[PDB]
């Protein structure tokens, strides 16, 4: 059963920290792909839930988090919650 | 074979159908008897 109210499993990632993390990743990718190119992050295009979501196990439970809120940006030359 | 309905909690929550309340006849210690079980399953673990 469920005691109390039903609430969705979720993950909290700091928005500013992730934005800085992606900025660093983009800089390093530009080193290989070109200083003047555009690096776009996007959600996984398809396949089993194991590969379209962030699969992990903590607390003894197996979580599948969307992550579409983390990889949805185009890089040209307070908190984020993942369902 | 499971006979499932939506969990349907008391409060409305835009997550209806994510958890199903499934009735089934499970085995028990003795092979001549079966036990009716009501279990909750996640939507992703069952197919119609």
């Amino acid at each position, epitope marked *: 059963d469920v005691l109390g109210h039903v609430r969705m499993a979720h993950c909290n990632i700091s928005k500013a920290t992730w934005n800085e993390t992606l900025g660093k990743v983009v800089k390093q990718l530009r080193k290989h792909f070109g200083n003047n190119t555009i690096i776009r992050f996007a959600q996984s295009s398809g396949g089993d839930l194991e590969v379209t979501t962030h699969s992990f196990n903590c607390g003894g439970e197996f979580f599948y988090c969307n992550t579409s809120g983390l990889f949805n940006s185009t890089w040209i030359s307070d908190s984020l919650i993942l*369902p | 074979t499971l006979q499932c309905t939506n969990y349907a909690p008391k409060l409305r929550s*835009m*997550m209806r159908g994510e958890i199903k309340n499934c009735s089934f006849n499970m085995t028990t210690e003795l092979r001549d008897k079966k036990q009716k079980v009501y279990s909750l399953f996640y939507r992703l673990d069952v197919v119609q």
Partner: antibody
Framework: QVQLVQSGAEVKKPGSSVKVSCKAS????????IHWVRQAPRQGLEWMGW????????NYAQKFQGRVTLTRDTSTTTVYMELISLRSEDTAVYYC???????????????????????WGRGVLVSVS | IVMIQTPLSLPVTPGEPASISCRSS????????????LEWFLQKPGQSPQPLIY???NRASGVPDRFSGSGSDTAFTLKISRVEAEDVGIYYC?????????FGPGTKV
């Protein structure tokens, strides 16, 4: 308890822009959609649109696309509707309502959509003349 | 858009039972959710509409037990065991299954 607080009244000339507030209290502001419904005098209820107070995504009835803009303030937990190009046929009481379904106990970051209106405010009468 | 009708807008006296009908041009039953999204409201004079029934038969909290209802396949009925002074106002039936939501003309008590 759960409340939506609206007050006052406004009178506008045709073509004017009016902002109608809806202050939320007693529940998590970001975990229910806020819907706007128009009620013309001596007429029935007409749905205008819905704003997601967490993301700011909105959806409007086809007749209101391009005329109604919804915004939010999550620090003040208030939803505002801005109406432009007011016409005589737009005289009505404008009600805000809280959806009956919660999105998630921690906010509207996921979900298919709402299906009901649980809490209604008193409404704001807007007249055009 | 789905059009909603509300037949039987009739005067009643105190203590009389009542029945208010609602008819939809399109079925309100969501196969995946296994529920019909029809919310009944009562708008008292001078007040905003308040919920009565959230899903055809599921009565809202705080609503007198005199209110009930049933139906399916677009045809729904709201029933009142006994009409009292607090039942005066306009009754509406929502079309929650799809956006935009519609309420129908409504009936008067």
């Amino acid at each position: 308890q759960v409340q939506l607080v609206q007050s006052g009244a406004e009178v506008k000339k045709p073509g004017s822009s009016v902002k109608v507030s809806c202050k939320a209290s007693g529940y998590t502001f970001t975990d229910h959609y806020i819907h706007w419904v128009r009620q013309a005098p001596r007429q029935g209820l007409e749905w205008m649109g819905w704003i997601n107070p967490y993301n700011g995504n909105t959806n409007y009835a086809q007749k209101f696309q391009g005329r109604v803009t919804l915004t939010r303030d999550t620090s003040t937990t208030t939803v505002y509707m801005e109406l432009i190009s007011l016409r005589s046929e737009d005289t009505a009481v404008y009600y805000c309502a809280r959806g009956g379904e919660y999105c998630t106990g921690f906010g509207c970051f996921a979900g298919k959509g709402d299906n009901s209106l649980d809490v209604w405010g008193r409404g704001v009468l807007v007249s055009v003349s | 858009i789905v059009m909603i009708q509300t037949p039987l807008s009739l005067p009643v006296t105190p203590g009389e039972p009542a029945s208010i009908s609602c008819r939809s041009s399109q079925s309100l039953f969501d196969i995946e959710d296994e529920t019909t999204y029809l919310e009944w409201f009562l708008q008292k004079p001078g007040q905003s509409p308040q919920p009565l029934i959230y899903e055809v038969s599921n009565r809202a909290s705080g609503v007198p037990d005199r209110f009930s209802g049933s139906g399916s396949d677009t045809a729904f009925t709201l029933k009142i065991s006994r009409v009292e002074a607090e039942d005066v106002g306009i009754y509406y039936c929502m079309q929650g299954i799809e956006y935009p939501f519609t309420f129908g003309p409504g009936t008067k008590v």
